[PDB]
Point group: D2
Chain length 295, copies 4
């Protein structure tokens, strides 16, 4: 037998960094959870018990802290590219570094209508992520995403005209609840190295904001024919506004809210146009995925 693939590192490394403006007294915090997996000429640590080729995962943890100390941690696309580049430049036998970053939300509090200088609030479990693959000789591939963005619209969603056969019981509808937890990923054009990543730094935060705004506005305003149709419109817009993006992938749960027939109780009307009370369903759930690129 042979080692066909191998990667190892440190997962779930929690990092907090604070910036302090000496002038204004205004402090800004950043919190993230970092994973780094390395590949390279490390097969003999598996086959021969040869640990000389292993950069200990504890050392990898240390390197994450040190790197955060000496460099900006925002935007995460940049920090990840610095962190990954470090490993392939520092260690001659390590030819790829895979860096995953989950950014947690610490939003500045408004107290008495005024932004507070050093107090924050986790105003949502929504994340902002990046996956950075730094491969020696092949540049830097970056996938940005937002996840855990949970929304619901109480009307202006439809689902009719679908295939009906002997396995079908679902009734067509022209008015239903649509709720989902949005997972959106935009993959960037391959970058040649750190210098090129640095040259596009302003585009990362701007593109994250545009992806979020487009997702929210399109969800809210589209008279949805289906989750499929709605998510395609989102992806189409994001591509049109950032040429450095090659693809956009959406993954959307369809979190069902069932009508409750209460007519058995005193002829109470609670279906169709009379539907007020619904039963949210934990499971099962639809799962719709699409990857959209350029023609």
């Amino acid at each position: 037998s042979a080692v066909k693939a191998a990667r190892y590192g440190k997962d779930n490394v929690r990092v907090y960094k604070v910036h302090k403006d000496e002038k204004t007294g205004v402090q800004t915090v950043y919190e993230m959870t970092v994973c780094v997996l390395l590949e390279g000429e490390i097969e003999t640590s598996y086959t021969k018990a040869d640990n000389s080729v292993i950069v200990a995962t504890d050392s990898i943890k240390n390197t994450i802290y040190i790197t955060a100390k000496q460099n900006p941690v925002t935007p995460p696309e940049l920090f990840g590219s610095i962190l990954g580049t470090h490993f392939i430049e520092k260690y001659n036998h390590i030819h790829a570094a895979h860096v995953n970053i989950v950014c947690h939300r610490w939003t500045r509090m408004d107290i008495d209508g005024k932004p507070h200088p050093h107090s924050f609030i986790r105003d949502s479990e929504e994340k902002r992520n990046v996956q950075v693959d730094v491969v020696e000789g092949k540049g830097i591939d970056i996938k940005s995403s937002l996840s855990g963005l949970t929304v619901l619209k109480s009307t202006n969603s439809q689902f009719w005209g679908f295939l009906r056969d002997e396995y079908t019981t679902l009734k067509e509808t022209w008015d239903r609840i649509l709720s989902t937890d949005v997972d959106a990923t935009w993959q960037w054009k391959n970058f040649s190295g750190l210098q090129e990543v640095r040259s596009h730094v302003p585009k990362f935060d701007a593109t994250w904001a545009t992806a979020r705004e487009v997702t929210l506005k399109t969800f809210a305003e589209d008279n949805s024919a289906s989750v499929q149709a709605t998510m395609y419109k989102m992806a189409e817009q994001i591509l049109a506004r950032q040429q450095l993006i090659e693809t956009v992938e959406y993954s959307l749960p369809n979190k069902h809210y069932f009508e409750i027939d209460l007519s058995w109780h005193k002829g109470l009307q609670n279906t169709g146009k009379n539907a007020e009370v619904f039963a949210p369903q934990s499971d099962p759930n639809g799962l719709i995925k699409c990857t959209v690129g350029r023609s």
Copy 2:
């Protein structure tokens, strides 16, 4: 042996209700998770296999939906009191009803600076809860609360002057991070029945808003001497502004963020005044509780 206590019912009943303003076209959604436990003369269902005294938990589920259909579900203090009163009035052998309600956040989206009529966003995992105990002959006891309100301040927190003995290693500090997930409960004066609860309906939403505002403002502005000292100030204010409240209870985790000594690496300075990068600790965590009443 004998039955000393017994209660049974339905837990985790998810409910969604929509209100539709025919005029403005503006829709408002409410989602909650409801638990109802009943007590009474039901001992023989345990001792004699006598199910004639059991109001099936499935029926209890049905009753929650029907009640939500026919009554307002906001404020939750009112809905809970209606739901609990129903069981003790309807069934002669059922002398107490315990109703727990967890309200989930569906916040109206702002699209292009304008409130959207029927789209929403789960803008936080923060909850608003109520525990309503309706006891026949003894009225209605209500405990309101907010939970999952997670905050962090990066400075203006201290902890020094504590007891030092041979079990102590903790260094005194005059500048640290303070982060917690707030759990606050305010217990109302016992109400005589539904009519009295109805008479104070406007006070429930107002008091929830005041408890939240006081918690946030006091956290942000207090130069904290300790979690103990800070939470007492919160409780003191809430009591002063709502006379119908008898007690206020806070339960606050102290979620630690440790300094990282990086001096072993090229004399890098990252402690004390030079501290920029911290390691958030998942566990363990301090746990501070206090119940404050009137003298």
Copy 3:
């Protein structure tokens, strides 16, 4: 306003201890998660910012490790009583200690039919817990429990003869699935102090084993008339076999498994006696509780 109640300490303190038999070479591991909350004359840490009365929670953490080093950690009833006694004896102003212990399962592996000397397997998420309240002048109150014991029987469960009115839709049944996650707690006679707790040490492990065996055997063999009726039989037996127990409390979810009517599809029969495929329900769920004592 005034401080009506106050307690503070350390939660989620993970502890691992290994015992090594020098003779046999056989090692035994113990893992637990510990919480300690203290009460006493500590009101001025809340009201006056007086930290001199605070035994830092970090020190409490240290004390847990030290105590585990110097004492047996099994049975948990004993370890908890030692840990709690320590705080009220050591600190003159601390009059109560509340100690919660969650024991995790590390079961010795069988390799080739032979017990392995130092390898283990988490053979279930079932726990064994204790809550120990050590109050100065009032002795030691201990509540032992097992939790997360999840079972299912595919027949020999019934539910008929329950109350039917206009809120009832549930059909009577003489054959259904019964599944639950068992939570059982047995409260011991108050002990006068550590010496008395030590004198009954052998009874703690024996009584835990009996409570588990009785729960499992009664669940498996009882032709259940209801969850109520079945759980009472369990409690009755446990009381009969350990006179040092004052009460036994069960809390049992009724985790529903619904029949699926597939007759709409080619007259497929899947209900009643023909029921083979069921839909497990995540929520809602029945919740049945009972506390049984001695007459």
Copy 4:
């Protein structure tokens, strides 16, 4: 823009099936959680709001229940292949079906040393999974796995001889705790269709048992030089015993247990050979992966 990839279906479909032996009266239960995602000529549901090409996810749910009713659900490799084949044979425009199955453990209870005919116990959160990709014209690809198998050995694990530079603080050790949650996947030779899958049915359960036994025995007996070295030995054996397997992939967290230096307290010795009490670390954790194939 264009649709580069698309798949949609139903996730988290919980299924329970019971088998009843009319002769012995012995009942056997199976529970699983199923996901089915379809691909094909369905791009116009995204681009043109054309739902005529959509086999509703609700219908997919129905089809899972019906299929379970009419076919064996064990081994899961077979059930998944039947379920996936159905979709590509039934619908002319659907060219691939992806079926994920998570099997939950319901282990027959032993009551009084005797197997009980219809009572079971969730004796672990360990799973048995399968991922089945049925592609029209390209056969059936099956990946079997076990996950959530959590183990710990208290000695006979080492880690020394690793790379040391200016980012290294980790001390070499010749005796440490090793604990992990095992994730093991074995990928089968591509099958031509259902008939070939049926012909190898006995090999699926046998190979799962061998993978589990090899994992446990090798973990327990190997004087581990590293997680890398140990997991390679496991993979090597599994390949040697089942020729129909092409690759074996392990993914192993290294769940750290830190020594606690208690010497600051009365010279208490708790490190090295004197180490008895450890602090389990929730995070961070090492993550080691390897894919092993045939040379």
